[PDB]
């Protein structure tokens, strides 16, 4: 027994990482067949990030103005294309390490773990939350962009994320694999808002769920309530509102527990109401929600 | 920027986890070179686990008796030892996969990546610290055991931990890669005692100047103390005592911020004695104690 933030294994995503150079920037990128994927702004100087026209920087470039290494090997470019705000380099190596892989774009509230690289290189892997308001509190440091977010079903990695910008307000922001911001983001060193972020209510239920498994049960409270009830509470605490869908998603939990999700949310509204008293839950002063429901399954059946 | 609890790359690991089987049991082994590690207790039934003599219940079996697999190869024994609390199995074949890597003791305080296994199959990667007891706080399912603990420097893994119980407590103990615990337990189905736990006070130094490099500055105040007077209000909140060796080790974390370490232990003194008042430090509610000085150093210069 015992909970953990857990990240899935690294190694298959480790096999695809290269270091991306066009003129004196470096970052990563990740090798999957005979292409390449990394920012666009691997292209840009400091200056040309305060205002970049991205079509007009490539222009400049031609295939070898793209020095990809894969450790000591550098793969030689035959082909260069921005989709969105990725750059696809065709290079004419298959990557041998290339997993069996899709790509994805994640929903507000998914998990997904992130390999932070430097250089091309690994440096640490750690399991974090796509916000509602579609930022993530990560740690990036100077050139740890191109660093990729994924999920593994068995055999098959779902890259869902690639690491672009910090905000002026210390998050960070980026694509999926076809270079499409999650949010209202842009891949330039201007002042943007994240706007209101909100906890992922379905999330919290999740934890507590996983808190009870793990005979962590003193919030369990004499009440229950109604879903409009609660959402009403929600509102007030910035959390997001729950809807059926999500009662129906933690029903495996309910089932495992004896707990009915609304009496789970009564427990809840009473936590958002009279905080937790200087107690914990799971290790925490403060409610979790970067767990998933499929997350809590996963670390309570032992899922490989 | 940005601050994470970071697990190592697990990839190098991941080509080193077997499935070990003797009669019943079923666990996790290790293969290094031509040796597959794995805890004695495999040999073990539930009914052996409440009074075992390993020693007698080793002599019943033959290399013939262990199925040692990895991936869809099963491998095959040519040669059997027990080491302490863990059996070397000699097979025929050289793990090809096998990292540059040392077994290491760890001191308490001193953190690790686990790699979770389930049928010597990596399910997930978390870090977590040694306790001054002795005990891990894991995410340990049924047949997790043999899953290893580590850390990497640069090329070479330094396997530090395996998973052998769970204590009726809820906590986690094992061993070295030599096979012997960490504290006070055996691998016995017995009620034992990990003692008074402390927090690692060095850690949370640490991780209250990762908090200052990050911005988060509240807890700053305007007292000073002595490294004495800061040991008196650290045993009464069960505390480590700070050394001289500790203040040391946070010297460079000290030269970046222009913090003195004993400044910082009056910030430390004041959090101890008036709570967090609700505040967060890197959006955690509580002082948290699993980040080394190395570890925060790590994260805010970005090693691979
Ligand atoms: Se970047
Ligand atoms: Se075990």
Known sequence: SGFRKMAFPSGKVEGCMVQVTCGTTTLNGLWLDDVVYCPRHVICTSEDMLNPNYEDLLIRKSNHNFLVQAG?????????????????????????????????????????????????????????????????????????????????????????????????????????????????????????????????????????????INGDRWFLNRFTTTLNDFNLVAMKYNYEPLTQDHVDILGPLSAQTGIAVLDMCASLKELLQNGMNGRTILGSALLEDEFTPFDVVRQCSGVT
Chains 1, 2 share one sequence.
């Open 72 to 212: 000591n090997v550098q793969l030689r470019v035959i082909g260069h294309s921005m989709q969105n705000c990725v750059l696809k380099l065709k290079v004419d190596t298959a990557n041998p390490k290339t997993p069996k892989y899709k790509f994805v774009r994640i929903q507000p509230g998914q998990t997904f773990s992130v390999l932070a690289c430097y250089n091309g290189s690994p440096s640490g892997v750690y399991q974090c939350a796509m916000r509602p308001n579609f930022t993530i509190k990560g740690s990036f440091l100077n050139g740890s962009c191109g660093s990729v977010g994924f999920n593994i079903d068995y055999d098959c990695v779902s890259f869902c994320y690639m690491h672009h910008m910090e905000l002026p307000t210390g998050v960070h922001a980026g694509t999926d694999l076809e270079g499409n911001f999650y949010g209202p983001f842009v891949d330039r060193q201007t002042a943007q808002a994240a706007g209101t972020d909100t906890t992922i209510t379905v999330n919290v239920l999740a934890w507590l769920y996983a808190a009870v």
